[PDB]
């Protein structure tokens with residue numbers, strides 16, 4: 001029972017689709033009796049595709065064609081990284097129903113691009129929560145946010161500028177994905193900072209923030 | 214006899230539409246027919262997915278068929294034929310989705326436990342008052358600190374019609390927590406799922422600190438030079 | 444919120460912790476009973492933490 | 502210094518002074534006064550704290 | 559232990575709630591509600607229009623302050639769904655907000671150009 005990889009195919013996206021499984025070149029697919037969201041939280045963690053959103057045990061019309069049902073049973077906690085960290089004891093135990101397949105709609109992961117500037121290390125901030133790129137707001141912006149986003153950018157440390165280059169690097173246009181983002185200084189990236197809900201902003205596009213480092 | 218439909222509880226929590234009829238052990242039969250037949254006539258195959266485990270327990274099984282298409286949401290005359298040679302009359306049951314029921318959003322009210330109840334210092338009953346929903350089926354789950362509470366902690370009633378309203382229903386959900394949890398100020402959130410809700414789920418939270426206050430202390434600082442808030 | 448919406452108020456009687464499942468709940472406004480259409484009482488259901496006690500809300 | 506008639510000041514009519522200067526951020530700063538703003542002899546504040554006993558999470 | 563119930567910086571109302579651990583018995587601990595409201599004595603009715611008349615009546619619907627119309631996420635067994643936190647909603651702004659900078663546009667004439675330049679109604683807000 002070695003799940004090397006669990007690809008997501010037959011779906012609109014790279015990591016939105018049905019769950020497969022790979023062992024010893026045999027591409028196989030997984031049914032499960034207890035197939036919760038935490039299993040998808042594992043599955044879109046070992047692939048590194050965002051947080052897990054939806055986990056449908058949704059059947060389709062029978063002419064799809066499908067691989068057989070994976071031999072072991074996979075029930076675990078969900079806080080772990082890969083499909084090897086939790087046990088898959090009952091090998092050869094196929095107690096799914098007749099013709100069904102699972103489905104995961106985990107998010108595309110957080111790609112963060114500093115746009116509008118001459119270099120990629122200096123520009124207005126733009127983030128990717130959904131498929132649409134969008135800026136973030138400067139409500140209660142702090143130097144902890146600057147050092148967190150520069151740590152995630154992999155581009156050194158902030159210098160805390162005098163706001164003139166940030167106002168000169170562009171107002172931007174589009175949508176504002178984040179407002180009132182608040183980083184504690186220790187988070188690896190911008191998702192793990194406290195913020196208002198994605199896309200719910202009380203600011204216009206004139207308040208798009210820029211981080212210089 | 215029973216044929217439990219997928220409600221909005223089974224639709225939303227599990228994301229799997231399972232047609233289920235329960236064949237109680239009236240008499241032991243070898244080839245128990247729990248064949249879930251469509252109005253079209255094709256049968257999505259189910260057989261003994263879980264035993265009934267009734268007090269008699271004489272060859273009783275539950276057949277759950279995953280007709281998970283849009284044909285249930287649109288609607289069809291689905292029939293499981295509980296036809297048996299023992300008691301030779303076929304004790305079948307037919308269930309369909311109820312058609313054209315008007316959709317009104319639930320107004321969800323979270324009632325804190327009574328002051329009379331906390332004086333006993335034994336248990337606190339938090340009431341989730343889901344009322345005003347005209348489609349009958351509703352799913353109510355309690356969470357504390359973002360973790361789903363166990364279903365033995367809370368008990369939710371069947372929806373019954375609201376008295377003054379014509380066809381709108383109401384439901385309760387009584388969460389029985391110990392008094393030392395509620396008096397320390399622990400947030401108990403009522404997650405309720407309904408079709409007529411815009412985001413499909415409403416979360417009311419209650420705790421002692423929000424509650425009903427027993428000492429408002431207001432300070433209307435009328436300052437000339439306020440201008441911007443600080 | 445119910446009084447804030449200004450169309451309806453629902454006073455809930457929470458009969459809980461009773462062992463035989465035989466409770467009759469009726470409401471009086473000022474000592475005389477309201478009509479049974481105005482209130483609705485749920486059936487006695489098992490209180491889950493207590494072993495055999497029941498509860499009912501009206 | 503701006504000289505206006507006396508009944509013009511007592512009927513509201515908020516006068517705004519705008520400046521134009523190099524060191525200013527948007528090059529323009531505006532301040533206003535009227536009868537009720539500049540050194541008034543009356544403060545007609547009518548606070549209405551409605552619905553404070555009603556719902557707040 | 560003053561948990562911040564609202565921190566509305568547009569009407570300046572701050573509401574904070576605490577359980578005062580007053581007595582030994584855990585019931586008479588008073589749920590204390592601290593409404594702190596700053597009333598701008600000279601701000602106009604429309605803050606973004608500096609020529610607006612003086613704001614005299616300051617009405618604060620405290621239910622409108624305490625509404626939470628940002629949908630939150632909840633974790634179900636099979637799904638993460640956005641969850642509405644109130645039934646109220648489906649803005650006067652007595653005071654300016656510190657984080658928000660408000661600009662008004664004035665008609666500036668020199669030789670009849672009427673170049674409409676935006677001011678800063680709140681300086682040291684977007685500098």
Ligand SMILES: *[C@@H]1O[C@H](CO)[C@@H](O[C@@H]2O[C@H](CO)[C@@H](O)[C@H](O)[C@H]2NC(C)=O)[C@H](O)[C@H]1NC(C)=O
Nearest residue numbers: 603604605606607608609610649650661662663
């Ligand atoms: C408050 O004042 C602002 C600024 O004068 C008003 O905004 C302008 O309103 C006019 C008429 O509605 C529009 O033609 C302009 O395009 C607006 N400008 C801006 C920058 O928004 C606003 O309408 C006023 N609000 C109230 C309630 O009086």
Ligand SMILES: *[C@@H]1O[C@H](CO)[C@@H](O)[C@H](O)[C@H]1NC(C)=O
Nearest residue numbers: 537543544545546547614615
């Ligand atoms: C004071 O405010 C009240 C509020 O309605 C208003 O009716 C009254 O005319 C005001 N009086 C003055 C002198 O501004």
Ligand SMILES: *[C@@H]1O[C@H](CO)[C@@H](O)[C@H](O)[C@H]1NC(C)=O
Nearest residue numbers: 430431432591592593594595
């Ligand atoms: C309410 O009372 C507390 C004392 O417990 C005090 O510190 C606080 O300032 C009061 N609230 C306001 C708004 O003044």
Ligand SMILES: [Ca+2]
Nearest residue numbers: 139179180202
């Ligand atoms: Ca904000």
Ligand SMILES: [Ca+2]
Nearest residue numbers: 138139657658
């Ligand atoms: Ca801002």
